[PDB]
Design a binder for this molecule. Structure first.
Ligand SMILES: *[C@@H]1O[C@H](CO)[C@@H](O)[C@H](O)[C@H]1NC(C)=O
Lengths: 98, 100
């Protein structure tokens, strides 16, 4: 869209606790046809399950990466939204699959 | 990636062969011995480095690497540990299985 993608915005935005990659860490030097970005919120216990070929209850039924997915994936604290003691729902993906 | 002239996270950050390389690269499928049901975390690889490796150099530094702009100490404000473990599992596919 006449977009040149700069990832300094992402390092500036928040202190991301998780940052995995399969290509390279700078991940800006790299052209590709599309970035096909996806986002979602997960419990911070199954973070390692969002990986190519990784088995688990999370991702194997909801959102999986089949193999050789461009590795780059990132995760930061969502506490600013999650504050209700009884909870709520808005950002939830399909719970699980049969 | 264990071949002359290749690039990637191992060719760039862990182990590189020279372009003018004579020798043999022998890969054995080791799932029976290296994988654990809980994951074998004894094997680590470098995911972050400031520059590419030269032929046959061995970088064993564990100093924290920062991907961001503000020089931080410790871990988690864009400061990351340069090495990551890989939990090898018997249930991984051929491309994710361990090889010696
Ligand atoms: C070797 O030492 C030089 C210091 O001039 C440094 O720049 C380089 O990264 C070092 N390489 C290794 C593999 O230690």
């Amino acid at each position: 869209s006449n977009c040149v993608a700069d990832y300094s915005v992402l390092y500036n935005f928040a202190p991301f606790f998780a940052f995995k990659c399969y290509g390279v860490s700078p991940t800006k030097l790299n052209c590709f046809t599309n970035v096909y970005a996806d986002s979602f919120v997960i419990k911070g216990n199954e973070v390692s399950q969002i990986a190519p070929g990784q088995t688990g209850n999370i991702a194997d039924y909801n959102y999986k990466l089949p193999d050789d997915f461009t590795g780059c994936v990132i995760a930061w604290n969502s506490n600013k939204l999650d504050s209700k003691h009884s909870g709520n729902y808005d950002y939830w993906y399909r719970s699980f699959r049969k | 990636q264990i071949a002359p002239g290749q690039t990637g996270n191992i060719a760039d950050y862990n182990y590189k062969l020279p372009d003018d390389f004579t020798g043999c690269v022998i890969a054995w499928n080791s799932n029976k011995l290296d994988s654990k049901h809980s994951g074998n975390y004894d094997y680590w690889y470098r995911s972050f480095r400031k520059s590419k490796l030269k032929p046959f150099e061995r970088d064993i530094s564990t100093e924290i690497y920062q991907a961001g702009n503000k020089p931080c100490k410790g871990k988690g404000p864009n400061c990351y540990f340069p090495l990551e473990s890989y939990g090898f599992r018997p249930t991984y596919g051929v491309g994710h299985q361990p090889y010696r």
